[PDB]
Amino acid sequence: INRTDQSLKNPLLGTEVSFCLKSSSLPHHVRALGQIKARNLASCDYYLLFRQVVLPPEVYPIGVLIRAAEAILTVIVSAWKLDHMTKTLYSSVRYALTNPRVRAQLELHIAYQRIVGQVSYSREADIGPKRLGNMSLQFIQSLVIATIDTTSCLMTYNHFLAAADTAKSRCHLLIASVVQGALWEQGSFLDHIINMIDIIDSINLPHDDYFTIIKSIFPYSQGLVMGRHNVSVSSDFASVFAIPELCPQLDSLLKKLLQLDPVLLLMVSSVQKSWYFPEIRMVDGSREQLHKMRVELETPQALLSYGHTLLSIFRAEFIKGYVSKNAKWPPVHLLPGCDKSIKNARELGRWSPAFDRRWQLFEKVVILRIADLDMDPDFNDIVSDKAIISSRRDWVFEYNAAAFWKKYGERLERPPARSGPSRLVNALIDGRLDNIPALLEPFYRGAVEFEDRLTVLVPKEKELKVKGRFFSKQTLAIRIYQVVAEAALKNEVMPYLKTHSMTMSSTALTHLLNRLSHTITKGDSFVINLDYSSWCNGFRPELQAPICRQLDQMFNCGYFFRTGCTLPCFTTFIIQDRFNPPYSLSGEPVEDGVTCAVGTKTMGEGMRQKLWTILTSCWEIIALREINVTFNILGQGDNQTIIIHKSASQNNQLLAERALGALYKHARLAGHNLKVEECWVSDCLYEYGKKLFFRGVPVPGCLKQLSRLFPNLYSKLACLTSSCLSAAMADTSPWVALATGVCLYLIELYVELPPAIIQDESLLTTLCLVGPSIGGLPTPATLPSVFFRGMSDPLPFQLALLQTLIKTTGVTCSLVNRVVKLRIAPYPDWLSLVTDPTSLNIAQVYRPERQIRRWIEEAIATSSHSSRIATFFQQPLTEMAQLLARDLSTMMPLRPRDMSALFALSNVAYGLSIIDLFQKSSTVVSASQADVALESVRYKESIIQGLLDTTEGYNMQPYLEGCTYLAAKQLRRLTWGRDLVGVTMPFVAEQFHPHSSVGAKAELYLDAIIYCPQETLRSHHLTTRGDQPAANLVKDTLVLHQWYKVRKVTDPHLNTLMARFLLEKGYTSGYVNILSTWLRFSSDYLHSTIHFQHVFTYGCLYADSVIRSGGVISTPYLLSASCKTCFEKIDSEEFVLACEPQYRGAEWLI
């Protein structure tokens, strides 16, 4: 199989191209050179060629897609009862799909996708010419020939994938931009997007300059917004970048966007993947990487002194946290000359405030053992996909034999097969990871075995850095050492760092973020945003050796941290340039400074992530404390936000200047030179979690997120739905996300399915409206969670959508049956219900694979040759899970919402989670397979055949007439024959019916929820805030038991099951919130938990809709109750388990 990837997932490399142009003598070279024109472009200039691709206008008949999208959105809105905005939504979609430029981009995306599909996973290796507009593609092995008229560019399949992904991202960007503009106060801004596209595509500067511009677009936009809307602190961030010099047109366009709306500028400027990715200059990039891993900014002696200072502050913070959490000092030994205050504080077991500014006093305090190193990592970390190298002897397997032979003139002594696994999961299966304490024993001593001292650096894909950034894949032993050290740091010491502890407790985190949002606008809390660039290639052994020693003594693991603290100096580093291999002298790499480097001062990116965080927090606390300013360090990565509170003595400007100077000075004494462009101060803009915040209100990522095993239609649609759901969870409007997702879903269906299905508007609509809940492809339509935050039953919503479709459009019920094609399972499958309470017992035909759990489990049980796995799978976990599910399926008031709860706190749930981790590893599933190429072809054929069928599944007439609540309960009764109760949640739309009170009649006043607006709302109000209002499975089980007893649920059988669950463990005895702060609640309810929150969200969504539809509210509006049958009284009688439990227990897990 050739050309496996269907999307850009690897860095763009050229060394292969250069090797094939001049070197190499394989048969494919003759064919390749034959099909190269005189004007052969370089691979580094591939984007200069794909920009010229033009397709004939309106080649794909996508009008059916337009009509289907219109109908789908109309149906969704009508179901939601927001009939005053369907006009806006479907008009926007039609305009988006009818624009000339937008349609051209969409057609280009479709052509790219079809060309990719026709060649990926092809056993053939010389696919003939393929026409793409004026280009004539041609594939050879993993190389591509692209010709337009006379110029050609010998590429790699990765380059073509990058071009295809660029076209796809531009399609997404344009569609989302039009839809978003249709729903804003300020009109369509699509023209600016098109203008930016044309301007950037018109850039003819060299490779490096063009990609510098593209990289700088976003930070320069931040600087532009910042320099205009700072009130307290100054700003010069925009000055550093050279955009206004290199590309004046882009600068003028960006300034125009800023003038229009800063939020819009941050919106559009955030796109960074919709522009062709660079080709890493591997020679220079690797040379720079290796040099940066061996440079000494600071003298080692000064670094060691500062390391001692950092050790002092680390001791201070740890002791403070330990005291605050246990009201007693940890075991410490006081050195001679210790200060009297320290003695008194230790004796009294308290923490005097004076220490906060006197960390130096802790230089005489040594912390003794407080825990033991957990040299037994849990499966959550071992079972992963991070590629690893088995040992040194496998280094020869990361290069091409032909390239090595040509470059040096000598063969490569590659053994017949790799001596060991290629990934962590394979290592675990093979039994390597069963005596970890012995595996890490060399680290304890301090002499890592020579066989485990090699590191391979890998370039990072989809990064706009021509020089490139490398992350490191490392030997199995070093990888396990890292895992153990990271777990220990994150579990035993990091929670005790008082100042740093308040950045991981979500409660404190959320409270701090809310306070920052409330105070940023008032001009009393500005933020400093440091973004280290050399952080990864930073820390030297000297700086961290003292803290490494203190940790070693703290965990009683002799020299376990110091060994990795000084390891890089004894390690061999190589660059995976598959066609630029290093020389091999005696079976080992030879240092040359470009491809190989034996011994460096740091272990590179990824390694010691947490320790570096601790050190950074330490020196930041030092820098800020000495100037006596309140601070709230907030950050985890190389970019950190420092929140500084106003001081009554001096204005924010002087405070910011002093803080920045101190940070410069102290980062200077760490070998972490901090430059101007990496730090900026602002009182209007700040960033956290890769998510901007302008004047407190978040900047939606509509244009960015919506622009984001073997492949299959189901997998692609699921990824689309998940991305759109994440965007909706962000500050993106639910309507923007929903419309964009509908458009994208229709495009995706158009790419795959044959014309017969596509040109069937009614069928296409029905397909888009049949969600997975009733059995069908994932769709953005059927998603109640888009508009809500809590758990919600999707079934009533799906039935409501189908009912509305039937009532409104010309689709007949027989067609719905044809598409839905209901197929009740022959026998109950209790495990599926337990692991997903709100699902019907139906055959999920479109699912990529069903019952595969036993296949993976069975494959793991055999062909293992391990010990941990053997004890982990003594008897089939799937069979026991089914047993437990059946056991829990004997509650006379069968309430799956609790069956899932009970099943959750059992060892079998953890075992199924581990199996899920195993299958998630694409290596395990491929190992289980016993190719995938035919599997996809068969899969595509089956679905294409399935819906082309004209067979019926089950007469749905009785299930699409009444309340979706009652209908859903009837459906569950039918599909399990047990009158399932306790999980159906009504649909807010049918439960109520919004009414404006302008025309309200006395009949409507009897019962409803009223919404009182303080003043008339407007589009401006939608973006400005107002004023109106392990063993832990034992504690959760205990609180569940306390919950039951408090409610007086005391059942002998349930008690026995719960006690068994205990003894097997060992124990024995925000989108709309801004408007929400603009209205007032109403508790004047008669009947009606969490569901009420959904009603409130719907009520305020009505106002959002009427405002966004060019309307205004003059009087309070009510929410009458329309469907009475959608109301019920719940008693929750008891969990009468009936038949006695038979699960027993595992006792092997944990």
């Binding site: 080692p300 030994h333 301090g446 003594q553």
Partner: protein, 50 residues
């Protein structure tokens, strides 16, 4: 007073421990610094787990 005269020995031990650890830090870094670019072996710096 049979134990107080012993605790001061322990503190004397712990004081030496820091002395040894500082020696190790310095010596370890000297050797590591000269080991860059050479095939110098990675000598152990701690006897063994008990």
């Amino acid at each position: 007073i049979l134990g107080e005269n012993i605790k001061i020995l322990d503190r004397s031990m712990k004081t030496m421990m820091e002395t040894m650890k500082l020696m190790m830090e310095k010596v370890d870094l000297l050797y590591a610094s000269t080991a860059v670019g050479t095939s110098a072996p990675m000598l152990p710096s701690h006897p063994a787990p008990p």
